[PDB]
Scaffold this active site. Structure first.
Site, mmCIF file in Angstrom:
data_model
loop_
_atom_site.group_PDB
_atom_site.id
_atom_site.type_symbol
_atom_site.label_atom_id
_atom_site.label_comp_id
_atom_site.label_asym_id
_atom_site.label_seq_id
_atom_site.Cartn_x
_atom_site.Cartn_y
_atom_site.Cartn_z
ATOM 1 N N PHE A 1 45.980 -12.152 2.006
ATOM 2 C CA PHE A 1 46.339 -11.013 1.940
ATOM 3 C C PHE A 1 47.976 -10.915 1.618
ATOM 4 O O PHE A 1 48.340 -10.242 0.787
ATOM 5 C CB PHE A 1 45.949 -10.188 3.113
ATOM 6 C CG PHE A 1 44.829 -9.968 3.448
ATOM 7 C CD1 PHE A 1 43.646 -10.943 3.848
ATOM 8 C CD2 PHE A 1 44.033 -8.641 3.290
ATOM 9 C CE1 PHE A 1 42.484 -10.740 4.094
ATOM 10 C CE2 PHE A 1 42.783 -8.442 3.459
ATOM 11 C CZ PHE A 1 41.957 -9.415 3.713
ATOM 12 N N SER B 1 43.897 -9.965 -2.228
ATOM 13 C CA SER B 1 45.267 -10.049 -1.989
ATOM 14 C C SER B 1 46.034 -8.712 -1.651
ATOM 15 O O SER B 1 47.173 -8.793 -1.113
ATOM 16 C CB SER B 1 46.206 -10.960 -3.144
ATOM 17 O OG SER B 1 47.576 -10.698 -2.611
ATOM 18 N N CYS C 1 39.697 -2.418 14.991
ATOM 19 C CA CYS C 1 38.258 -2.189 13.976
ATOM 20 C C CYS C 1 37.299 -3.091 14.650
ATOM 21 O O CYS C 1 37.651 -4.176 14.469
ATOM 22 C CB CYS C 1 38.480 -1.751 12.607
ATOM 23 S SG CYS C 1 37.415 -0.752 11.590
ATOM 24 N N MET D 1 43.205 -5.636 10.972
ATOM 25 C CA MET D 1 43.203 -4.394 11.666
ATOM 26 C C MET D 1 43.068 -4.458 12.867
ATOM 27 O O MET D 1 42.082 -4.607 13.635
ATOM 28 C CB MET D 1 42.032 -3.299 10.926
ATOM 29 C CG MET D 1 42.265 -1.602 11.180
ATOM 30 S SD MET D 1 40.895 -0.596 10.396
ATOM 31 C CE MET D 1 41.395 -1.381 8.673
ATOM 32 N N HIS E 1 9.436 15.421 8.588
ATOM 33 C CA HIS E 1 10.076 14.905 9.583
ATOM 34 C C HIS E 1 10.041 15.554 11.075
ATOM 35 O O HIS E 1 9.563 14.826 11.914
ATOM 36 C CB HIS E 1 11.538 14.882 9.112
ATOM 37 C CG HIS E 1 12.158 13.498 8.672
ATOM 38 N ND1 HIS E 1 13.079 13.043 8.799
ATOM 39 C CD2 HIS E 1 11.246 12.469 7.752
ATOM 40 C CE1 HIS E 1 13.239 11.798 8.272
ATOM 41 N NE2 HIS E 1 12.157 11.606 7.639
ATOM 42 N N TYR F 1 28.498 6.795 -17.357
ATOM 43 C CA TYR F 1 27.325 7.235 -16.767
ATOM 44 C C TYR F 1 26.148 8.106 -17.580
ATOM 45 O O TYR F 1 24.978 7.858 -17.549
ATOM 46 C CB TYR F 1 27.270 8.134 -15.399
ATOM 47 C CG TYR F 1 27.925 7.254 -14.267
ATOM 48 C CD1 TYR F 1 27.525 6.181 -13.892
ATOM 49 C CD2 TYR F 1 29.111 7.539 -13.830
ATOM 50 C CE1 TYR F 1 28.188 5.402 -12.853
ATOM 51 C CE2 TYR F 1 29.982 6.973 -12.799
ATOM 52 C CZ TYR F 1 29.239 5.617 -12.304
ATOM 53 O OH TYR F 1 29.897 4.828 -11.342
ATOM 54 N N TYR G 1 16.679 11.246 -17.529
ATOM 55 C CA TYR G 1 15.533 10.226 -17.047
ATOM 56 C C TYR G 1 14.067 11.060 -16.539
ATOM 57 O O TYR G 1 14.277 12.131 -16.065
ATOM 58 C CB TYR G 1 16.209 9.354 -15.705
ATOM 59 C CG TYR G 1 17.135 8.629 -15.907
ATOM 60 C CD1 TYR G 1 18.580 9.306 -15.929
ATOM 61 C CD2 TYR G 1 17.233 7.247 -15.737
ATOM 62 C CE1 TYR G 1 19.746 8.477 -15.884
ATOM 63 C CE2 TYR G 1 18.210 6.441 -15.748
ATOM 64 C CZ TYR G 1 19.703 6.868 -15.845
ATOM 65 O OH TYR G 1 20.832 6.347 -15.844
ATOM 66 N N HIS H 1 12.222 2.568 11.435
ATOM 67 C CA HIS H 1 13.238 1.905 10.546
ATOM 68 C C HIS H 1 14.578 2.385 10.698
ATOM 69 O O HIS H 1 14.726 3.652 11.258
ATOM 70 C CB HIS H 1 12.665 1.910 9.045
ATOM 71 C CG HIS H 1 11.976 3.317 8.384
ATOM 72 N ND1 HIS H 1 12.651 4.315 7.935
ATOM 73 C CD2 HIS H 1 10.708 3.434 8.030
ATOM 74 C CE1 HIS H 1 11.816 5.294 7.490
ATOM 75 N NE2 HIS H 1 10.459 4.468 7.497
#
Ligand SMILES: [Ca+2]
Ligand SMILES: [Cu+2]
Ligand SMILES: [Cu+2]
Ligand SMILES: [Cu+2]
Ligand SMILES: [Cu+2]
Ligand SMILES: [Cu+2]
Ligand code: NA
Length: 1034
Positions: free
Chosen positions: A388, A592, A674, A684, A103, A36, A48, A1014
């Site tokens: 899997f 897998s 799930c 799951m 907001h 990074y 930056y 949105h």
């Protein structure tokens, strides 16, 4: 109060590591560090250019005010109390159009600070786009349902530019509006608060900025060796940061011990931002409930309180593992200012001494090797479960060597303490550690593994010495706690003072976890995870049960990367018979060894989940991992109450922990699973069982009325976006060109119209007449017909399958007769008995009408994506009571990225709609893009219409979200706040959704104009999960 704030949009270079360190972080070597923060030719590095808000004294903007160290790149703090008028004076010193959009606060259509098609003109676009140099006044009034009644004195809110908000946010324009009650503030600071901080967990994608071109040229030393699509390059620009401070660099977080600290947290960004903030070895509470973790997603708003204890220096990590090893760390520095401590003196202090060993075994994610659900051998040719479990060449398959914690009786780790009857469900989970408030847990730990390990708990107290994760510099002498040698033994003192246990309003016992703390990014995934359970003083039997509860269960829904097991190596040796061919970086290999599990069992194989009808059941849930550990743990058939709210489905994340209270009513073999698409298909899903342990007639209580909706499944051309003029004006307003992956038709691609199977209402049981969609029903779209019901009824759904393959219909919360749904063959028509008991409508603290989803259950996933989803609202039987005028409206909103690639109608879709049906490579991931449809109620880009209302109405928005892992969604209404819970005791303007989250949102419109709605996640705004609602002036 009338308040003024001078804020300037300057341009600058922002340093994401601000020297000079050279710190010791968790699961981070200098290779990570460098990915990074090096630094060209083909990498921009650690600094930056960004455009950022800054504070000034005057509307001359000639002198500044220093933003506190700890703020980092965030704009300055705007406090507002209720009814204040805040005048934000802005000057855009930067090189392009920007804005200032607030907001939790009220504004005309010309103080919004945002630009979309809203029917506005001339005098109302002076807000919408500040060109370079221009100055502007944004007028704010603190006049929403502002902080809740049950919200604390001050809450977290934000502001930022909204020209292209993702790209303006990326570019650095984002800052906090703290919003307080009339009148908590003495001299801009909440009375009786010692410290006030603000934090942002942003994964700040500097690829999306406006300054990449300027940033590559300026910093990449060889800028034609710069493919902006270089998978790697892109990810080199993702700054996993806290106020824009990557890798432990965030400065200025110091506080005296015994200080009252308010923390004003928020998420920001994209799908990648599934945060999980942890303030290490510290006391937390949100809304007078204990919190150990603080999850944050895009624009997730939330405050918390802390009394800062334990002088020293501690990690403020985020335990999303992939985030954690991209250095999403920082330190806070708890002083010893020698303030006097109010010491109780908890009487009768008990010591829970446990003997645990880490050791090896093989699992056996499927003892049975079969799918209890579908019946099949997991390895059948073509099955989703095969991938899997498949074994041979370069596929390990079904069983993995794992280190796992296990319990011993004493000192000499010689006799076990064998897995008893009800502990059968634990599986891979270690033994439960448990205590009461005031106690002293101790855990004698012995290692019997290849590698070195520890035990890091969650949400108990430990002195520096006892901390089982290493980091610094923090002044630690002994590294022994944090590093236990492959055959050493350490013990291990934790306290549980009052502030770490459950509160006044909390459940009896809190769900928690303990893990091995060396390298979290591998030790948990290796099997080193156990449940913990801290309870209220005297709420426990000396054996360790909850005094008034029959059965307790534990669940750990996580996706097990064997890919990062300490023993991947050991396993490739031990189970592949071409170990030399094993490419560890092969996608298809990596798959897998992703064991989508619960308690380390898959495809139906979890034992232990057994209970008798009408017993006190207390489920304790938790999870760990990364941004693909979003979960919806839905119990079919039964529901639970948690802190006075009713659902059936547990939204889980990394280090989230939920305590669920259930008393189960229907008898049978029901499904824990799930909802998250991929976890289901990937195994799951388990079973639990409610048995008749006395009985004994066959109904144990009640029902009243009986209502008959005539519903049908059919089967139609669904356009997702029939106009484009909205999208077109949007992009014309922001001065962007852009084509759209999903909608544009291309050479070979589909675009917008797809064959789908929608639920509909029919008048008779002849179905010759389909109910006409009202006018304030017209907003529903792809949704099925609304279904109302009242706490008491029964609902007959008569269901014709006017479709071309087996579907069904069924609803969350709702009750039926025993654990099964009936399929409904094409042409054939069938009736369903949905009972609606007390346990199907609002709880204590639920607002009265609560929604659920009704959906197909032939094929949970393929049916759902095909078109078959609807809302079921379950209102509390009101009263004899009140009469004289109300006014009232309702809106059901369903947030779902519709995976058309999963449609049964895909074949026909392709043949029918594409210009060349041959060129469609179905695994092509240009194409798996064009058919991921990002939509609210199956509509996009302002083509979801007739969200229309009037000033002063009482709107209930029934928001729900379903689907995949990508389907975390954050709902934001422009113009207005809202409340949730009964009455309206919590206010916010971003509501957090995942698959299995359904909620009633009480809004009280009061401002004429057309307003935007949105998802605040960056990918979804840009994909088209957006629309407007209009509020009208009486
Ligand atoms: Ca406007
Ligand atoms: Cu994170
Ligand atoms: Cu926003
Ligand atoms: Cu979303
Ligand atoms: Cu907004
Ligand atoms: Cu917005
Ligand atoms: Na970089």
């Amino acid at each position: 109060r009338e308040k003024h704030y001078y804020i300037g949009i300057t341009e600058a270079v922002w340093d994401y590591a601000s020297g000079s360190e050279e710190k010791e972080l968790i699961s981070v070597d200098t290779e990570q560090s460098n990915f990074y923060l090096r630094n060209g030719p083909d990498r921009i590095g650690r600094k930056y250019k960004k455009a950022l808000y800054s504070e000034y004294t005057d509307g001359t903007f000639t002198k500044t005010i220093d933003k506190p160290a700890w703020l980092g790149l965030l704009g300055p703090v705007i406090k507002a109390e209720v009814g204040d008028k805040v005048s934000v004076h802005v000057k855009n010193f930067a090189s392009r159009p920007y804005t200032f959009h607030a907001h939790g606060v009220t504004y005309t259509k010309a103080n919004e600070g945002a630009i979309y098609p809203d029917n506005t003109t001339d005098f109302q676009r002076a807000d919408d786009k500040l060109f370079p140099g221009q100055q502007y006044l944004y007028v704010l009034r603190a006049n929403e349902p502002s902080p809740g009644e049950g919200d604390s004195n001050c809450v977290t809110r934000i502001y930022h530019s909204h020209v292209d908000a993702p790209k303006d946010i990326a570019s650095g324009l984002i800052g906090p509006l703290i919003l307080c009650k009339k009148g908590s503030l003495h001299k801009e600071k909440e009375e009786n608060i010692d410290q006030e901080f603000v934090l942002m967990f942003s994964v700040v994608d500097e690829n999306l900025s406006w300054y990449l071109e300027d940033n590559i040229k300026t910093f990449c030393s060889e800028p034609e060796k710069v493919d902006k699509d270089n998978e790697d390059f892109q990810e080199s620009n993702r700054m996993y940061s806290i106020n824009g401070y990557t890798f432990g660099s965030l400065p200025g977080l110091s506080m005296c011990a015994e200080d009252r600290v308010k923390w004003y947290l928020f998420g920001m960004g994209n799908e990648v931002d599934v945060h999980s903030a942890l303030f290490h070895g510290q006391a937390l509470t949100s809304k007078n409930y204990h919190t150990d973790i603080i999850n944050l997603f895009p624009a997730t708003l939330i405050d918390v309180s802390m009394v800062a204890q334990n002088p020293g220096v501690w990690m403020l990590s985020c335990q999303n593992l992939n985030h954690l090893k991209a250095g999403l760390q920082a330190f806070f520095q708890v002083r010893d200012c020698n303030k006097p401590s109010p010491d109780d003196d908890i009487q009768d202090r008990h010591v829970r001494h446990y003997y645990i060993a880490a050791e090896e075994t093989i699992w056996d994610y499927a003892p049975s090797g079969t799918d209890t659900f579908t019946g099949e051998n997991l390895t059948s040719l073509g099955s989703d479960s095969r991938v899997f479990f498949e074994q041979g060449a370069t596929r390990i398959g079904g069983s993995y060597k794992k280190l796992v914690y296990r319990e011993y009786t004493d000192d000499s780790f010689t006799n076990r303490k064998q897995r008893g009857p009800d502990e059968e469900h634990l599986g891979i989970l270690g033994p439960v550690i448990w205590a009461e408030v005031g106690d002293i847990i101790r855990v004698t730990f012995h290692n019997k593994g290849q590698f070195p390990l520890s035990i890091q708990p969650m949400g108990v107290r430990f002195t520096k010495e006892n901390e089982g994760t290493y980091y610094g510099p923090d002044g630690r002498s002994s590294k022994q706690a944090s590093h236990v040698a492959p055959k050493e033994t350490f013990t291990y003192e934790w306290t549980v003072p009052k502030e770490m246990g459950p509160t006044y309003a909390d459940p009896v016992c809190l769900s928690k976890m303990y893990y091995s703390g060396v390298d979290l990014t591998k030790d948990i995934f290796t099997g080193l995870i156990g449940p913990m359970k801290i309870c209220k003083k005297g709420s426990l039997l000396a054996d360790g049960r909850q005094k008034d509860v029959d059965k307790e269960f534990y669940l750990f829904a996580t996706v097990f990367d064997e890919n990062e097991s300490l023993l991947l190596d050991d396993n490739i040796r031990m189970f592949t018979t071409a170990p030399e061919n094993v490419d560890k970086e092969d996608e298809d290999f990596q798959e897998s060894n992703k064991m989508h599990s619960m308690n380390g069992f898959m495809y139906g194989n979890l034992p232990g989940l057994n209970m008798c009808l009408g017993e006190s059941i207390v489920w304790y849930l938790f999870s760990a991992g990364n941004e693909a550990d979003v979960h919806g743990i839905y119990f079919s058939g039964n529901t639970y109450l948690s802190k006075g709210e009713r659902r059936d489905t547990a939204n889980l994340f990394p280090h989230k922990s939920l305590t669920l209270l259930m008393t189960p009513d229907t008898e049978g073999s029901f499904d824990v699973e799930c909802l998250t698409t991929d976890h289901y298909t990937g195994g799951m899903k388990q079973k639990y069982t409610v048995n008749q342990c006395k009985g004994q007639f066959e109904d144990v209580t009640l029902y009243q009325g009986e209502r008959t909706y005539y519903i049908a499944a059919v089967e139609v051309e669904w356009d997702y976006s029939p106009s484009r003029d909205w999208e077109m004006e949007l992009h014309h307003l922001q001065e962007q060109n852009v084509s759209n992956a999903f909608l544009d038709k291309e050479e070979f691609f589909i675009g917008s119209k797809y064959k789908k199977v929608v639920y509909r209402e029919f008048t008779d049981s002849t179905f010759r007449e389909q109910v006409k969609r009202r006018a304030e029903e017209e907003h529903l779209g792809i949704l099925g017909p609304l279904i109302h019901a009242d706490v008491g009824d029964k609902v007959k759904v008569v269901f014709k399958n006017m479709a071309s393959r087996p579907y069904s219909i069924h609803a969350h919360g709702v009750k039926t007769k025993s654990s099964t749904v009936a399929p409904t063959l094409p042409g054939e028509v069938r009736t369903y008995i949905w009972q609606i008991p007390e346990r199907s409508g609002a709880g204590t603290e639920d607002s009265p009408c609560i929604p659920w989803a009704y959906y197909s259950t032939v094929d949970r996933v393929k049916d759902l994506y095909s078109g078959l989803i609807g809302p079921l609202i379950v209102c509390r039987k009101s009263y004899v009571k009140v009469f004289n005028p109300k006014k009232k409206m309702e809106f059901s909103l369903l947030f779902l990225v519709f995976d058309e690639n999963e449609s049964w109608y895909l074949d026909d879709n392709i043949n029918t709609y594409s210009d060349h049906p041959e060129k469609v490579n179905k695994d092509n991931e240009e194409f798996i893009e064009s058919n991921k449809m990002h939509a609210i109620n199956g509509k996009m880009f302002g083509n979801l219409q007739g969200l229309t209302m009037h000033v002063g109405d009482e709107v209930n928005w029934y928001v729900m979200a379903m689907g995949n892992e990508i389907d975390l969604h954050t709902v934001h209404f422009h113009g207005h706040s809202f409340q949730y819970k009964h009455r309206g005791i919590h206010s916010s303007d971003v509501f957090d959704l995942f698959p299995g989250t359904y909620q009633t949102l009480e809004m009280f419109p009061q401002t004429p104009g057309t307003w935007l709605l949105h998802c605040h996640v960056t990918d979804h705004i840009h994909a088209g999960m957006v629309t407007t609602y209009t509020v009208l002036p009486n």
